[PDB]
């Protein structure tokens, strides 16, 4: 599929999928789904690095709501961008 | 002991007391929180006092738990840390206090919090044996509240690895099947299994592996006995001893359905289960709906998991049987409880709230909804005859006839087109209702607006099937507006007003009735909007924009307009905006109604408007002016409306003398006075536009204020996202006074550049780029000439500002802007200047090794690696990827080219420079990828 | 959305060699993912109309990007789809 | 010798002569044996059509097996070595809503045909994509018209994207005189011209499109070139002969694509089909 | 593999297949009986043809003049122009002619010119052969399906060994071998009684007149040493395998490939074309 020939792990098919049906546009460009599926596993990554990072520092090798929501607060980008 | 006595003054009422007892117990935690953690739970323990008084110690617990138990907390405090001996005391003093059934529920509550939160931070690594100790209650003393406890800390402690391989999950589903198989469980003890079971569920829905035999197997396993376990449970009866018990529990088996139908393939839970549990659904609404005769609630809570399960096994057919049942069913619990006619009947804007659906609730109207949207076209046909039979005969009977129209119309909005073998004469007799309805004098207020609101889903859904539709639309819709007018409800009035809404959707109302009969409609429709307009709450108020954008569509564009119509429009539209200008919703369709309102204009008709109009905003303006125009809601959105007006120039002409003298000192003072970065932004938006529409005759003597309010803005006094639309204002004062201001070029052009450099925000980089464009299309050389000249951190600004020109071209927005950015770079390339040869830009990134996605925490070590080309191989570039995004050999293509859109001028540049820069673009040609090369050579064809 | 969820944990296995994610936790990120593509998608959308262009391509999204991303988050999602799609394409 | 036969007296020399008059009767007596052996032949072909049209349906999944044919396959894997038919514990506690979302046997043909030592070399992955539309193999025996075998491909129009045709057929031919050893020997062959949707589909061509603006004939024109490639589906449209090519070229022609193509479709006639399903499972190896 | 692996449909499905093959085979089974009744019908017809150029090669019986311009014809179109006749030799008498009856080893030569069975014959068998008149074949209907070779010597004038008639018998396997053909079963034939070890071309005589050194007793020896020949195609291999006869049956499996080999050569091309092969044209 074209995910792995991008170098990703995110479905590009399903990101193209609901573009085109949610007529956002009368086309969706080959890229444009690519770009957006890279964009979304990035910031992820960002939120599961910084989760893991909260979890470790209690410790704990588990992700649970409370380390999700504090690496969130405690991160002013993210916080900007997620509340 | 003396924490007693700090309990009762924390527990009393007066602040003095309770304030001193708060800190007393702080300072002593600040000293040592030991004592205190102790004391408290030997308070919970042993007092045996006042329920009360334990309680509160056990809430004190779950303050001082937070602040004192562990760093890991935020609301941690480092005065001192809760010794180790007393940690293990409170955990085993917690969970003999939560585990005993014995105990009053809010202590046993109480406890239970407070180990939801310590285990939430201490578990597994402080506090191994947790779920030991649960587990051996559940199973040993059968402690039902340790299954609650249970519940509540599964997945928060309850890892993939125990569940399926520590033997967690096996030994949970055990507890889980022995309780409901075990016949004289009481239903309290099921209703707790059954949430336990859902925690299972959820567990075993999605995990790393998904491919694991052992995980599979034991999936497979739990979920059959599961479907043959819930199938006997809905099989039980109780006899009426306990309906709250028996709904609650209902709910629950429904609930673990609907999740293990929707979240686990379909392997598992095959058609023939399905089929089984549609039998017993429907049978369980019909109980459920009998049942009813708090019960109220759990039964509507019930019904929404039954419901939810139909709506997921929908696709199964229906018998006619069946039909009947879940209509009369759904006709039960659909009908509006007293409660809530009450609350629409005093307060119409929460009708307008739930109706447009931005109301947050979601009850089994909701869900009925979905129910019906779901459906398939056989079964939908066959419904909506059932539907429409139980209307003809209801129409006496009030009380459900609202159910039924509301079912009528959530099956008109499915998408499927209702077809059948006599839907025909259904539907013929269903309008003859639907008019009988309107027309009925003593119908009442409920029924009538929702006949109001379900003729245009009738008249939509079948407008094709149905004989002289226009008649019959116009008809209607007299009919509503009629009823709408001269009836002192505002459930009627808004009612009708979405109404018109709906036919809006499906009808040319202008074709449909005509130019005399749309007018007449439209000063209808603005009438009621006026009358409404009086009580509306900020959803409302975004409903009546709504309509009001909507009747604005209609007005005759024709030469011939009613001036009337024209003046009540603008009138409703500023009016209705000014209540509540921070209704996002409102000013965003404000500005629609107001831009579709001089959608074309023309001189004679801008003077009247502007003579209307802009009088109200300097009025706005001024109030403002006392307020030093600090940030306003209705500020912005006079600035906007402003904005929207000067955008919107007639073009016969000039602006008008009058809107000079009108706004330039107004918007003069606001952006010489004003100091916040909105305010200031639009304010500049506004005052470039009136500078660059206005004839340059008509403004000249006003050079000297424009320049004053110019300097101010480029000193940096305001900041730097304030000032934001400073390049847009810059190019008008070029453009209107080209000559006067030739000697502070020199100036503005530096304070741009210098602007343009430090700033990361996109649109402040774009308007400041702007204004190079501009020079540089007005004279390149004389742009090259400054960039180079000036100089920033002992670099000549050039190469910083091409860098930053090359990469902001990958982003700009808007048509004109990108064709004058490309103009622009066309002139530069043009030029062919030794300066711009030497400079140096960056090409594409250099990725990494491997797939690593590059954090903000890789970034110290892992930068954006660029590759570096002259400037003019990258302008190349850049307008060749224009090209891909739009739509072999040199000397062949240089010879096979011998013998106002993007695309045309991508184009045309590109053959002249292949004609003319022989040398330069020949290099470059031999240079590009073959990729390039051949959509280049592809769009030269 | 449960597709997301998978792909939630293999992100996660690269980030961190082992580390377990609670059932909860997994949602709200779902929700956080839906949300961004909601908003990047409909401001792509109002970019390419606004750009009176019919198609919805790598520049709208890497506008939308910019606008929507606070800070270090625009540049580094701007480079993850840049080299995304370099790596795609070719 | 030639000495010898020299020496012969002139008796001996009539004697040898009458001797191969006799021959010659032989050769007409294997004649009218070679026709009987058609006619029975075709008559049998006859009586394995039932079977062969049972399996075909069991193959594309329009029939189900039942329980007395299961039972004689079970019996028969008991014998000799099939254990591999044996159903175990796993498999019965499945559901035919889970099985039948596969209906068939998945290439089931192209599987037996690329087992086959001669003609799977012929099958290229491009001819073996439309095999995976083929669920039936055919014999026809040319009674009427010239004597010969016709070999019958079937496909789905409805499914099948590469051409039009549902069946699509080859033809063998044998001259009018048996041959030396009293065998048929060969006529030159025939085949269909499949109906190719479109060029681009089509198997048996390489195409190319290039627009030019020429300069050498000033004209702004489009050009198409076809070139035949090597191919499975080349075992059809065999080669014919032009006198005065037919001396020079078409003699190697004939002498290697006939052998060939001979060859593949006896293989085809005699171990493919009778053993069609030892062939797919390579018990016919 | 995979195939079974797949769920129970496919492994159903195969069964009813291996059911059809079943019922394919007891068809095929049929179609062979019916192939063997033909065979045997048509071999009737083989066999006038045959025996009537045995009697011609033999010379008891003789051409006729209808025969001999056909033959004469059919030599025309074949282009084998060897055997045309000469005015040289119609020269000669009729006295000269019937100096010999048969065609002087005919059946020898249309032997040596065979590619695989000329070289078992030696020259003493090369004498034998003279005395060889016909070669018949037979089909075997009872029991094991087979086929039987016969060679008729005239043993009034012979003076090697007094069979009149030897016969070779051959054996299929009782069901159908794969891909609907048989394969061979041990094969069994008669045993020559040879005149006397000196006349007896399957051996090497040696002949000693002693007087033993030990007893003094006064003895004539006839010794007797098998040699091979083409009479070894009789007493062909013994059995097709059996306990006692493993080391032999090493060679019985080698010689019953060889002899196989040669009656089938026999059956296809010799017995059915005999006049080429004599005259050396089927080369």
């Not at chain 2, 007892?21 to 935690?29: D, M, P, R, V, Y």
């Not at chain 2, 470039?688 to 000297?704: C, G, V």
Request: charged share 25%.
């Amino acid at each position: 599929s074209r995910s792995a020939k991008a170098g990703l792990t995110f479905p590009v098919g399903r990101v193209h999928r609901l573009l085109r049906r949610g007529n956002y546009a009368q086309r969706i460009g080959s890229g444009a789904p690519v770009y957006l599926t890279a964009v979304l596993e990035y910031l992820a990554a960002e939120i599961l690095e910084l989760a893991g990072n909260a979890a470790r520092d209690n410790k704990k090798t588990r992700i649970i709501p409370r380390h999700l929501q504090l690496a969130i607060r405690n991160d002013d980008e993210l916080n900007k961008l997620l509340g | 002991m003396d924490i007693n006595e700090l309990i009762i003054g924390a527990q009393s009422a007066d602040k003095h007391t309770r304030e001193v007892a708060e800190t007393q117990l702080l300072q002593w935690c600040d000293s040592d929180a030991s004592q205190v953690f102790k004391a408290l739970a030997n308070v919970a323990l042993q007092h045996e006092a006042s329920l009360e008084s334990r309680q509160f110690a056990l809430l004190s617990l779950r303050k001082l738990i937070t602040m004192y138990w562990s760093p890991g907390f935020e609301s941690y405090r480092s005065t001192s840390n809760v010794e180790i001996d007393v940690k293990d005391f409170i955990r085993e003093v917690l969970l003999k206090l939560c585990l005993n059934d014995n105990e009053n529920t809010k202590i046993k509550n109480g406890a239970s919090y407070c180990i939801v939160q310590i285990s939430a931070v201490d578990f597994p690594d402080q506090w191994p044996q947790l779920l030991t100790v649960i587990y051996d209650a559940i199973s040993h003393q059968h402690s039902l509240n340790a299954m609650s406890l249970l519940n509540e800390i599964y997945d928060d402690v309850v890892s993939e690895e125990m569940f399926f391989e520590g033997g967690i999950g096996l030994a949970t589903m055990e507890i889980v099947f022995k309780v409901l198989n075990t016949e004289t469980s009481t239903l309290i003890a099921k209703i707790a299994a059954l949430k336990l079971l859902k925690a299972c569920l959820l567990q075993m829905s999605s995990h790393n592996e998904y491919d694991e035999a052992s995980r599979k197997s034991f999936v497979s396993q739990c979920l059959a006995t599961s479907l043959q376990i819930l199938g006997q449970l809905l099989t039980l009866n109780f006899g009426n001893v306990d309906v709250i018990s028996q709904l609650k529990f209902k709910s629950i088996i429904y609930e673990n359905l609907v999740f293990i139908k929707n979240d686990f393939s379909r392997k598992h839970f095959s058609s023939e289960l399905q089929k089984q549990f549609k039998i017993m659904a429907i049978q369980d609404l019909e109980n459920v709906t009998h049942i009813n005769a708090p019960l109220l609630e759990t039964v509507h809570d019930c019904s929404i998991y039954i419901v939810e399960f139909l709506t997921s096994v929908c696709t199964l057919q229906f018998s006619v049987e069946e039909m009947n049942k879940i209509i009369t069913s759904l006709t039960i619990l659909c009908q509006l409880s007293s409660e809530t006619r009450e609350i629409w009947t005093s307060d119409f804007n929460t009708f307008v709230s739930k109706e447009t659906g931005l109301a947050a609730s979601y009850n089994v109207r909701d869900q009925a909804n979905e129910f019906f949207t779901s459906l398939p076209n056989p079964q939908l046909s066959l419904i909506f005859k059932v539907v429409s039979n139980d209307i003809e005969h209801s129409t006496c009977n009030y009380s459900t006839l609202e159910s039924l129209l509301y079912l009528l119309q959530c099956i008109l909005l499915n998408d499927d087109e209702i077809t059948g073998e006599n839907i025909d004469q259904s539907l013929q007799i269903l309008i003859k209702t639907l008019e009988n309805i309107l027309v009925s004098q003593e119908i009442p207020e409920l029924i009538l607006a929702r006949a109001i609101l379900t003729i245009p889903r009738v008249l939509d859904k079948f407008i094709d099937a149905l004989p002289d539709i226009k008649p019959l639309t116009s008809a209607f819709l007299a009919k509503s507006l009629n009823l709408a007018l001269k009836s002192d409800k505002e459930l009627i009035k808004s009612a009708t007003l979405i109404a018109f809404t709906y036919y809006c959707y499906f009808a040319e109302l202008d074709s449909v009735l005509g130019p005399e009969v749309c007018s007449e409609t439209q000063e209808k429709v603005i009438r009621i909007i006026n009358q409404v307009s009086s009580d509306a709450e900020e959803d409302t108020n975004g409903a009546l924009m709504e309509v009001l954008s909507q009747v604005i569509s209609y007005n005759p564009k024709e030469p011939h307009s009613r001036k009337e119509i024209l003046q009540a429009e603008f009138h409703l539209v500023f009016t209705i905006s000014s209540e509540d200008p921070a209704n996002v919703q409102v000013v965003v369709q404000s500005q629609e109604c107001l831009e579709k309102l001089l959608d074309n204009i023309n001189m004679d008709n801008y003077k009247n408007y502007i003579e209307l109009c802009l009088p109200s905003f300097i009025n706005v303006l001024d109030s403002n002016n006392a307020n030093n125009y600090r940030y306003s809601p209705l500020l912005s959105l006079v600035l906007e409306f402003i904005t929207v007006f000067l955008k919107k120039k007639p073009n016969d002409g000039f602006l008008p003398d009058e809107i000079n003298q009108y706004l330039f000192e107004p918007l003069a003072k606001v952006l010489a006075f004003s100091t916040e970065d909105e305010t200031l932004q639009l304010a500049t938006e506004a005052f470039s536009y009136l500078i660059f529409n206005t004839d340059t005759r008509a403004m000249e003597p006003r050079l000297m204020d424009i320049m004053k309010v110019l300097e101010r803005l480029l000193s940096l006094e305001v900041s730097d996202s304030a000032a934001m639309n400073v390049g847009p204002l810059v190019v008008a004062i070029f453009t209107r006074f080209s000559k006067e201001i030739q000697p502070l070029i020199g100036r503005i052009l530096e304070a741009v550049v210098v602007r343009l450099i430090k700033t990361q925000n996109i649109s402040t980089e774009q308007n400041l780029l702007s204004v190079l464009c501009f020079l540089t299309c007005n004279d390149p050389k004389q742009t090259v000439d400054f960039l180079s000249s000036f100089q920033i951190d002992n670099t000549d600004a050039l190469t910083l500002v091409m860098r930053k020109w090359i990469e902001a071209f990958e982003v700009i927005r808007g048509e004109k802007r990108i064709k004058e950015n490309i103009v622009a770079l066309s002139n530069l390339f043009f030029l062919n200047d030794k300066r711009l040869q030497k400079v140096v830009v960056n090409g594409n990134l250099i990725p990494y090794e491997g797939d690593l996605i590059i954090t903000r925490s890789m970034a110290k070590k892992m930068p954006d690696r660029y590759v570096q080309v002259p400037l003019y191989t990258k302008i190349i570039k850049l307008f060749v990827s224009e090209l891909s995004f739009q739509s072999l050999d040199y000397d062949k293509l240089k010879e096979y080219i011998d013998d106002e859109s993007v695309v045309q001028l991508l184009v045309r540049f590109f053959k002249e420079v292949a004609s003319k820069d022989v040398s330069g673009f020949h290099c470059i040609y031999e240079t590009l990828s073959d990729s390039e090369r051949k959509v280049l050579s592809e769009a030269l064809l | 959305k449960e597709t997301y969820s998978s792909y939630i944990y293999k992100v996660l296995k690269q980030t961190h060699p082992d580390t377990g994610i609670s059932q909860k936790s997994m949602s709200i990120l779902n929700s956080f993912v839906n949300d961004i593509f909601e908003r990047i998608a409909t401001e792509a959308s109002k970019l390419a109309a606004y750009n009176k262009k019919s198609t919805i391509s790598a520049r709208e999204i890497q506008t939308a990007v910019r606008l929507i991303l606070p800070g270090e988050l625009a540049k580094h999602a701007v480079s993850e789809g840049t080299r995304a799609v370099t790596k795609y394409s070719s | 010798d030639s000495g010898y036969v020299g020496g012969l007296p002139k008796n001996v020399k009539e004697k040898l002569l009458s001797l191969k008059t006799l021959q010659s009767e032989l050769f007409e007596v294997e004649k009218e044996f070679q026709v009987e052996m058609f006619e029975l032949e075709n008559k049998f072909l006859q009586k394995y059509k039932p079977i062969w049209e049972q399996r075909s349906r069991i193959i594309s999944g329009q029939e189900q097996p039942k329980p007395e044919q299961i039972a004689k396959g079970q019996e028969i894997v008991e014998s000799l070595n099939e254990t591999e038919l044996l159903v175990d514990e796993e498999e019965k506690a499945q559901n035919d809503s889970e099985e039948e979302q596969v209906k068939g046997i998945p290439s089931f043909w192209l599987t037996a045909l690329e087992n086959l030592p001669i003609v799977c070399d012929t099958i290229t992955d491009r001819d073996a994509e439309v095999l995976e539309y083929l669920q039936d193999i055919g014999l026809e025996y040319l009674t009427d018209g010239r004597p010969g075998f016709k070999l019958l491909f079937r496909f789905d129009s409805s499914a099948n994207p590469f051409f039009t045709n549902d069946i699509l057929c080859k033809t063998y031919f044998y001259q009018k005189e048996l041959g030396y050893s009293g065998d048929f020997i060969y006529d030159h062959a025939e085949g269909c011209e499949i109906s190719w949707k479109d060029n681009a589909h089509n198997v048996t061509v390489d195409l190319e499109m290039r627009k030019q603006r020429n300069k050498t004939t000033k004209q702004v024109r489009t050009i198409e070139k076809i070139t035949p490639i090597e191919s499975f589906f080349n075992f059809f449209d065999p080669p014919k002969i032009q006198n005065e090519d037919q001396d020079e070229e078409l003699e190697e022609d004939l002498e290697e694509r006939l052998a060939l193509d001979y060859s593949i479709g006896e293989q085809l006639k005699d171990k493919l089909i009778p053993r069609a399903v030892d062939w797919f499972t390579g018990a016919a190896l």
